């Protein structure tokens, strides 16, 4: 039984499925998806479309100029809640896209910074049941995501809620005082995350932007309650308290579990003006992250009508096809003695490990047969072209390792050459 | 004038009437009185009928099985509030029962763990004025209790309120995190106890299960306000702060005032399945408690219709008759140099003291005339059969004391032989 | 057993002996007693308290600074009075028997006053009576003498103030909020010294002064639990700045808690040469103070300021024995009493009256003796039964007359009392 | 790099070596080892722990107080055992090779137990092994010997308890909440001493005991960051009373965190003369304890209590080598394993069973060897593939039969095992 203090809660370690999953889908979707527009002066020129309302409150910004042109100056940001009808939304079609993309978990924004809630919460009427789609989007997405056999978590903007503030964030230091600040908000955040736990029992609680100072001691109780109901549940590292199951990162060997998050593009919310990572670059991000002990949480930004855009869908299916082929070198693997290496050509290389098996993943395919890995030595054994299963020649030449893999096998690979030694 | 800090409030000592009263009546009565049913796995097999709702939230328990049989699985615990009509309730009949039982104070549950309030509180509609009896039960019981010349206090479940939680207590350690937890509850508890003070000015504030952590500093102010309005008021020791007027106990020579509480049976709330303490055993509990500096708070559990059950009433009237006879050896007494002694026969003995007078109370009546009290010596004087006032022979034989009391006088006593030395 | 948290420590109520004691002796005695001198907003510039001599000396051009420079010299540091403090003619058995005869039930000397000098052989400083002037453990030897005479023994300790740890004087009352030792080192020192007093002498009272250092306040829940588990009948005053205390103190309806009034037989606490009998209370005024305090639920802690050589001046000796004769006589109306429903009344004439209580008996103590047989107490009625003259037991005639009470005491029985007419209602 | 705040310090997970180590040696050795004596609610009056000798001695009329007065005399203070502690026949290379042969992967001696005596040349007290009996840095010389044998080296430190700073004994368990050093001085001392151990010996485990002084708890976020940045493979137990720890401890579904069970080969931790083989575990019981602990995700920290002269008694020596032979054999089922889906099972006969895991392999360790070829494990089914006898590798016939598991192991292969039948599922 977990107790509500930091010493006891650190008994809860990252669950097995999370370390083994490797790849998950972030979904940023709300009333900001309706306009879906973006471009130290970062907040004046904000490339993140989820931040639309903040950008709109800055009357000197490009966002305000776009809004007046499109919707008119008398159109409050709140009004987007009536436009957000998600008419073309099919949660089974989403889940199946995510499944074929190779994802093992999915995490939608239940409430982003703008305070709009995508479920039928009883602590505010500013929600998707009373407004917009007249629908519990979190609950319907959950059923569908799990109908596809995937795990389901929830994002919650605990640290920011612009239903509780009026002045915008213009500079990064404005974040230290433009927060809800009240005891009432601390209660509200606690009650809303407890509600998500009771209604949807998520496998991940993914907070953002810190937790209200007045509510930090509540998390002792919230985590104990969560873990005692759901020990395979997990918690990210954005609460500003001394517990977390995994760390997060946006810039990118650790002994702790962590997770790298980014959009297919730059923006997390849908952005009309959009800069995208090719299929190839997304494969090299996945591999590099997993080789260093991490999971990749890749963000999809749907449109207001519930459709995932064209350029996003095709990057995701291209990722999933590469994962059906090279999945055994990704899923369920631990790190090696080191993550990295190069060739004389200048091709980078990444290692993973399932038992005594170890996978060597090239970020690219070498032109030539004779490949020379700088500063690697292998202790005897047998080494194979993973994809074909074909035995290859190898010897140790000094500090380097010489391997020759036929042109025949190189042409079968897609995006990465993958080998496998025992 | 009392100030709101612990150093000043400890100037408030237990008032005179409380130490002199010796015997009070707990009354556990609410919507749980309607079903009135009970049997480390204590919470699965909970013999306390007040805990019905908690037991019902455990779907694997005998309570849930009884409830489905009797009321059906679609019957919410809250629905008992409409059944709780207290139609046969007569508060003057209660008070007069308590008076003849020998009680000097009465304490009903204004709000137990289930959160239902027996007065017309303005901070929730889950109360006896809006629901059930359409009546202020705390206010009517108060008037009647004081019409009989008795003092009136209030119990309040500050530490537990199941209107603010959904998950049940299964194990004792669940109590450390399954509490309301919010700032809103801390305010609610403070406001509701302030309301009881303003409406009913009780002579005892009897909290239960601790006070919300977020509200503990409020009690500085609440106690100062209470004492400055009502210096003869008193406060129990279940707030989890550094002040109290008397201690409480459920298991049973101290320099501090305390109070032992138990049901006539095991359960505090009415329990169909019910194990009762005979009249005799209740007399020996009273005496033993008072001889050690305590008061006995004995609990009555009425039925939903407002009647105190048969077996409870008869135990209470049997207690009160013994108190009309031997009351001067109980009421208004202080402890002696020691509480206790035995005879060679093995009969226990207890001492009390009014001035230089001291009472020797046997838990039983010896068969024989010659009685031998082990390890007692008396400094000269005169020693009498309390009930008859008759002088007796006595001498000191070593460390023991020999007394002979005629068979004639022994037969007049009921339950206890009582003597009196000067 | 007591545990070290404030909630648990409230279980320790005031010991029955201290409640019943009613009267005890303070003793302010130290190296300040050697010069033994003070003057007849600006209290610290013209300090009439001889204990405060070093502080006054630190204030250039104070009256104490005049008397120090002419009498001892400017180049003569206060610390060196410790070698002049020899206690030549000290006899602890002579003190303990004086105090016994005075009616006192407990005795409390200053083990360390504000100047930091310790009157026992503490191991945490050499600035003490064993290494310096007396070459004697004064606290220990007085403890034994006091205890052989059958009295309880407490210790005073200046926790909040130690001038061995500060240089700058207190000039104004607001200076007390910052001119303190302030260090963690000082907090440890104070804790270790009071633990040492507990272990060596197991006193019946721990009487701190001037608050406890802020950094050491949390230590006191450990020290109090430690003290009480070794000595359940121990007691603690209210000058530590923490939630727990056994009795309150003061130097200036009734309370339901135990408290203690303290004052000198004279004005100054430490011996003052420059203080004649005009600043001293007579035997009458001392009995009136005792009765007044006791009727309000307190003990009186009366201070005696001895000379550097260990003798108590005759003036002070005299008043103590006079008090004791009155207490040998009227003691059954003082010792072991409680408060009545009210403390006070007065006659139409103007003689103050005070009340105490032992069970159903009620003592009516007049502060003075009326010069007429017909006595009218204003604004009092009695529950009646019988009212008698306390000393002889003789029943008197009395009647409630409206809001007042009327009572006939023969001149024969008024002449049997000393200082106070005493009656008794049952 | 690690930063000094609890949130940042959770980044330091338990080092892979400690997770994989499975078995280490405690060594309780000090001046208490000289008398080396204890007895066969009231645990402190009749203490069977020889380490606690000084505390027992402080309790007048305890069994330890009897044995001290007759054997050494009443006037003989516990402190002077430090001069009798000479470690005449101590050889650290002999210990380190015993421990190596026993299969241990780490070794942890008491650098300072509750009595405050330090087994290294600390500069913060003279009450240590360099200035006193051994005239030797015992911690330093054992560290080198342990490290030359290829083992990891930790340090035990009694932070929460130091009897050089308290006089009064622990008589009851509630006394531990207040009879503590309590000063800021003590908090500084403990911090400086453990920083000194870090700087001198850079241990692989910091094993505190009895909590950390409350006034020093905030220091530990600085000390932990300091320790880990100098030594990332370092580890810290859970007896400091702060949010951060690397493994939990105990002396009495599975956990997902690392923990450690500690117990003596006998009852007492420090050497006890008055303790024969009836209070000692056999080789069988030690292997059963190790397996049980490891199947539940812990290491076993087995304590050895050496004599004052530095020798380990033959009884204790014997059991260690027996264990080691079993671990030389079945080590691939212990070292570097993890927990399986469940710890335990039992046969219909009643032989307990435990599980461990290396990748896809699953070891079925019987606590005992069945006396029949047909074996029925209750309430278990296997994912199957193949089940083989671990030692020989030979594939066995097996079938799931309802809720149980059936398995035929020839008598020839049952006779190849020592103490435990071991199987293996792939």
Rounded CA-CA distance D294/D286 in Å is 12
Q: How buried is residue C277: exposed, middle or buried, by Cβ count under 10 Å (0-12/13-18/19+)?
A: exposed
Which technique? X-ray
Residues of A with CB below 8 A from D359's CB?
354-356
One domain for residues D191 and D211? yes
Cβ count near C117 (within 10 Å)? 27
Cβ count near A224 (within 10 Å)? 23
**Contacts A–D by Cβ distance under 8 A:** 49
Q: Which residues contact D230 (CB under 8 A, 6 or more apart)?
A: D198, D202
Rounded CA-CA distance A123/A120 in Å is 9
For residue B207, give the nearest of B156, B260, B166 by alpha carbon. B156
Contact D345, D353 (CB under 8 A): yes
Residues of D with CB below 8 A from A243's CB?
7, 10
Rounded CA-CA distance D18/D26 in Å is 15
One domain for residues C268 and C403? no
Rounded CA-CA distance D124/D135 in Å is 17
D341 lies within 8 A of chain A by CB: no
Residue with tokens 């000194």: D196
Rounded CA-CA distance B181/B185 in Å is 7
- Asked if the Cβ–Cβ distance from B13 to C256 is below 8 Å, we say yes
Mapping DSSP to helix (H, G, I), strand (E, B) and coil, where does residue C284 land? Answer: helix
Residue that terminates a domain, selected from D301, D335, D369: D335
One domain for residues D223 and D368? no
The domain tally of chain D equals: 2
CA atoms within 13 A on the CB side of D203: 28
For residue A121, give the nearest of A103, A106, A132, A137 by alpha carbon. A137
Rounded CA-CA distance D226/D284 in Å is 42
**Beta strands in A294-369, from DSSP E residues, in sequence order:** 294-300, 340-342, 348-354, 357-362
Contact D152, D17 (CB under 8 A): yes
Mapping DSSP to helix (H, G, I), strand (E, B) and coil, where does residue C356 land? Answer: strand
Contact A157, A112 (CB under 8 A): yes
Residue with tokens 């779907």: B59
Q: How buried is residue A164: exposed, middle or buried, by Cβ count under 10 Å (0-12/13-18/19+)?
A: middle
The tokens for A324 are: 């059906």
Helices and strands counted in chain C (H then E): 12, 16
One domain for residues B158 and B226? yes
Instruction: Give the torsion through C-alpha atoms of C79, C81, C87, C92, to 10 deg.
Output: -40
Rounded CA-CA distance B121/A19 in Å is 52
- Asked if the Cβ–Cβ distance from B11 to C257 is below 8 Å, we say yes
- In eight-state DSSP terms, residue B175 is G
One domain for residues B88 and B77? yes
Contact A393, A369 (CB under 8 A): no
One domain for residues B219 and B176? yes
Rounded CA-CA distance A56/A38 in Å is 11
Q: Which residues contact C294 (CB under 8 A, 6 or more apart)?
A: C22, C300, C334, C337, C354, C356
The partner residue sitting opposite A355, judged by closest CB among D5, D257, D360, is: D360
Instruction: Give the torsion through C-alpha atoms of B269, B272, B278, B284, to 10 deg.
Output: -20
Contact B392, B419 (CB under 8 A): yes
Residue of C nearest to B334 (CA): C359
Please work out, in degrees rounded to the nearest 5, the angle formed at the alpha carbon of residue C177 by the alpha carbons of C29 and C237.
Answer: 50
DSSP H stretches of helix in D22-165: 53-58, 63-71, 81-84, 92-101, 138-148
Question: Touch between chain B and chain D (3+ CB pairs, < 8 Å)?
Answer: no
Mapping DSSP to helix (H, G, I), strand (E, B) and coil, where does residue A305 land? Answer: coil
User: Which C positions 171-210 lie with beta carbon below 8 A of chain D?
Assistant: 184-185, 187-188, 191-192, 199
One domain for residues C237 and C374? no
Rounded CA-CA distance C339/A350 in Å is 88
Residue of B nearest to A4 (CA): B177
Residue that terminates a domain, selected from B331, B361, B388: B331
One domain for residues C119 and C13? yes
Rounded CA-CA distance B95/B143 in Å is 9
> Phi, psi at residue C343, to the nearest 5°?
-80, -40
CATH of the domain at B112: 3.20.20.80
For residue B298, give the nearest of B287, B318, B282, B309 by alpha carbon. B282
Angle between helices D184-201 and D219-230 (to 10 degrees): 0
Order of all β-strands in the sheet with C404-408: C344-346, C352-358, C361-366, C422-425, C387-389, C395-401, C404-408, C374-377
The tokens for A177 are: 């005082």
Q: Which residues contact B374 (CB under 8 A, 6 or more apart)?
A: B341, B342, B343, B344, B399, B400
Mapping DSSP to helix (H, G, I), strand (E, B) and coil, where does residue C93 land? Answer: helix
One domain for residues C53 and C143? yes
DSSP D3-39: -SSHHHHTTSPPPHHHHHH-EEEEE--SGGGTT----
Instruction: Give residue A62's domain range.
Output: 1-331
Angle between helices D314-330 and D92-101 (to 10 degrees): 40
Rounded CA-CA distance B276/A191 in Å is 43
Rounded CA-CA distance D31/D112 in Å is 11
Rounded CA-CA distance C147/D131 in Å is 45
For residue C319, give the nearest of C36, C91, C103, C50 by alpha carbon. C103
Residue of C nearest to D170 (CA): C226
- Give how far A11 is from chain D: nearest CA, Å: 6
> Phi, psi at residue A362, to the nearest 5°?
-85, 135
- Give how far A129 is from chain B: nearest CA, Å: 23
Q: What is chain D's alpha carbon radius of gyration, rounded to the nearest angstrom?
A: 23
C340 lies within 8 A of chain D by CB: no
Residues of D with CB below 8 A from A293's CB?
none
Contact C164, C180 (CB under 8 A): no
For residue D282, give the nearest of D270, D272, D290 by alpha carbon. D290
The tokens for D138 are: 């015992």
One domain for residues D67 and D194? yes
Contact A10, D243 (CB under 8 A): yes
One domain for residues C241 and C353? no
Rounded CA-CA distance C191/C178 in Å is 20
* CB contact burial A361-400 (16+ within 10 A = b; e otherwise): bbbbbeeeeebbbeebebeeeebbbbbeeeebebeeeeee
Rounded CA-CA distance C306/C28 in Å is 7
Please work out, in degrees rounded to the nearest 5, the angle formed at the alpha carbon of residue A103 by the alpha carbons of A101 and A105.
Answer: 150
One domain for residues C322 and C425? no
Rounded CA-CA distance B156/B109 in Å is 6
Rounded CA-CA distance C37/C271 in Å is 7
Helices and strands counted in chain A (H then E): 12, 18
Residue of A nearest to D1 (CA): A254
Residues of A with CB below 8 A from B174's CB?
1, 228
CATH of the domain at A362: 2.60.40.1180
Rounded CA-CA distance C79/C132 in Å is 11
B251 lies within 8 A of chain A by CB: no
B195-to-B28, B136, B191 alpha-carbon distances in Å: 20, 13, 6
Residue that terminates a domain, selected from B331, B362, B381: B331
Residue with tokens 């669940």: B174
Rounded CA-CA distance C390/C420 in Å is 11
The tokens for B269 are: 């709330």
Contact A63, A38 (CB under 8 A): yes
Instruction: Give the torsion through C-alpha atoms of D322, D326, D329, D335, to 10 deg.
Output: -120
Residues of B with CB below 8 A from C242's CB?
7
- In eight-state DSSP terms, residue A213 is G
- Asked if the Cβ–Cβ distance from A244 to D13 is below 8 Å, we say no
Total count of residues recorded for chain A: 422
Contact C136, C130 (CB under 8 A): yes
A7 lies within 8 A of chain B by CB: no
The tokens for C197 are: 């007093």
The tokens for B322 are: 């013994």
Rounded CA-CA distance B107/B101 in Å is 15
């Amino acid at each position: 039984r977990y107790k509500p203090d930091w010493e006891s809660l650190r008994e809860h370690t990252v669950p097995k499925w999370f370390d083994k999953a490797k790849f998950g889908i972030f979904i940023h979707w709300g009333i900001y998806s309706v306009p879906g527009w973006a471009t130290d002066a970062w907040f004046f020129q904000n490339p993140y479309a989820e931040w639309y309302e903040n950008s709109l409150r800055i009357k000197e910004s490009p966002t305000w100029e776009y809004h007046v042109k499109t919707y008119g100056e008398n159109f409050e940001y709140e009004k987007f809640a009536d436009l957000f009808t998600a008419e073309k939304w099919d949660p089974q079609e989403w889940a199946d896209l995510f499944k074929k993309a190779g994802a093992k978990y999915v995490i939608p924004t239940t409430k982003h910074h703008d305070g709009f809630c995508l479920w039928g919460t009883k602590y505010t009427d500013f929600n998707s049941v009373k407004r917009g789609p007249k629908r519990d989007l979190v609950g319907d997405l959950a059923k569908a995501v799990r109908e596809a056999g995937l795990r389901f978590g929830v994002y919650y903007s605990g640290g920011l809620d612009w239903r509780f503030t009026t002045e915008p964030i213009r500079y990064p230091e404005d974040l230290s005082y433009i927060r809800p600040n009240t005891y009432e908000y601390a209660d509200y955040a606690y009650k809303q995350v407890m509600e998500l736990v009771d209604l949807y029992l998520p496998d991940v609680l993914w907070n953002d932007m810190g937790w209200p100072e007045k509510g930090k001691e509540d998390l002792k109780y919230l985590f104990a309650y969560y873990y005692n109901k759901h020990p395979e549940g997990s918690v990210n590292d954005r609460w500003g308290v001394p517990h977390w199951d995994f760390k997060t990162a946006e810039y990118h060997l650790p002994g702790y579990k962590w997770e790298f998050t980014r959009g297919i593009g730059l923006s997390f919310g849908y952005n009309r003006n959009e800069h995208m990572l090719s299929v190839e670059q997304l494969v090299y991000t996945l591999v590099d992250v997993v080789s260093k002990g991490g999971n990749l949480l890749l963000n999809v930004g749907p449109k207001g009508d519930g459709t995932i855009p064209d350029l996003q869908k095709e990057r995701l299916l291209g990722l999933g096809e590469w994962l059906r082929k090279y999945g055994d070198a990704i899923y369920g693997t631990s790190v090696w003695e080191r993550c990295c290496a190069k060739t004389e050509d200048g091709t980078e290389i990444r290692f993973t490990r399932k038992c005594n098996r170890i996978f060597v993943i090239f970020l690219g395919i070498p032109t030539g047969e004779k490949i020379v890995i700088e500063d690697l030595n292998l202790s005897a054994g047998t080494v194979r072209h993973f994809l074909t299963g074909e035995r290859l020649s190898f010897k140790n030449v000094g500090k380097n390792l010489e391997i020759t893999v036929p042109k025949k096998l190189l042409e079968t690979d897609s995006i990465t050459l993958v080998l496998e030694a025992v």
